[PDB]
């Protein structure tokens, strides 16, 4: 089977101010070959995290993500590229792409929607026809 | 994103 990146789901609904972890899975047969693995997460035109030769390149990460966005590295040997972003903001809503090279290469898109703090209380404020 | 041809065509940064 061709090299395929999978997503557990393609839409995350997250609360403003929470921490979110979004995931892309890739095939790893036995032990992970870190020399081979390249991971890049992007949203809009912003570098969220790139990972190559076993390390994150934080000098290329967009400044809005400093101290906020990382890969859960220990998940990579399980074939899981798990991006955690702390203290989610309204402007974190949008379309994210995970790009993975591990011999073969593929990518997926994930949408994030962010609920503001009073969204639940106001859900039934005023419905319309 | 700046790595030669890696992911060329898939990203917007740069």
From Swiss-Prot, chain A:
GO-annotated biological processes: adaptive immune response; cell surface receptor signaling pathway; cellular response to lipopolysaccharide; immune response; negative regulation of activated T cell proliferation; negative regulation of CD4-positive, alpha-beta T cell proliferation; negative regulation of CD8-positive, alpha-beta T cell activation; negative regulation of interleukin-10 production
Keyword Cell inner membrane: no
Post-translational modification: Ubiquitinated; STUB1 likely mediates polyubiquitination of PD-L1/CD274 triggering its degradation. Ubiquitinated by MARCHF8; leading to degradation. Deubiquitinated by USP22; leading to stabilization.
Positions of the Ig-like V-type domain: 3-111
GO molecular function: receptor ligand activity; transcription coactivator activity
Keyword Glycoprotein: yes
GO CC entries: actin cytoskeleton; early endosome membrane; external side of plasma membrane; extracellular exosome; nucleoplasm; plasma membrane; recycling endosome membrane
Disulfide bonds: 24-98
Factors inducing expression: Up-regulated on T- and B-cells, dendritic cells, keratinocytes and monocytes after LPS and IFNG activation. Up-regulated in B-cells activated by surface Ig cross-linking.
Tissues where this protein is expressed: Highly expressed in the heart, skeletal muscle, placenta and lung. Weakly expressed in the thymus, spleen, kidney and liver. Expressed on activated T- and B-cells, dendritic cells, keratinocytes and monocytes.
Family of this protein: Belongs to the immunoglobulin superfamily. BTN/MOG family.
Functional note: Plays a critical role in induction and maintenance of immune tolerance to self. As a ligand for the inhibitory receptor PDCD1/PD-1, modulates the activation threshold of T-cells and limits T-cell effector response. Through a yet unknown activating receptor, may costimulate T-cell subsets that predominantly produce interleukin-10 (IL10). Can also act as a transcription coactivator: in response to hypoxia, translocates into the nucleus via its interaction with phosphorylated STAT3 and promotes transcription of GSDMC, leading to pyroptosis. The PDCD1-mediated inhibitory pathway is exploited by tumors to attenuate anti-tumor immunity and escape destruction by the immune system, thereby facilitating tumor survival. The interaction with PDCD1/PD-1 inhibits cytotoxic T lymphocytes (CTLs) effector function. The blockage of the PDCD1-mediated pathway results in the reversal of the exhausted T-cell phenotype and the normalization of the anti-tumor response, providing a rationale for cancer immunotherapy.
Protein name per its UniProtKB record: Programmed cell death 1 ligand 1
Organism encoding this protein: Homo sapiens (Human)
């Amino acid at each position: 089977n061709a090299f395929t990146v999978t997503v557990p789901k393609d839409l995350y609904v997250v609360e403003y101010g929470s921490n979110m972890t979004i995931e892309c899975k890739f095939p790893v047969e036995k032990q992970l070959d870190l020399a081979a693995l390249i991971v890049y997460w992007e949203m809009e035109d912003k570098n969220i995290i790139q990972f190559v030769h076993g390390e994150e390149d934080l000098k290329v990460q967009h400044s809005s993500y400093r101290q906020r966005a990382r890969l859960l590295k220990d998940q990579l040997s399980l074939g899981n590229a798990a991006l955690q972003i702390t203290d989610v903001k309204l402007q974190d809503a949008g379309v994210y792409r995970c790009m993975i090279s591990y011999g073969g290469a593929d990518y997926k898109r994930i949408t994030v929607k962010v609920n503001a703090p009073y969204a639940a209380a106001l859900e039934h404020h005023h419905h319309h026809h | 994103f700046f790595x030669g041809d890696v992911f060329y065509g898939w990203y917007l940064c740069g």
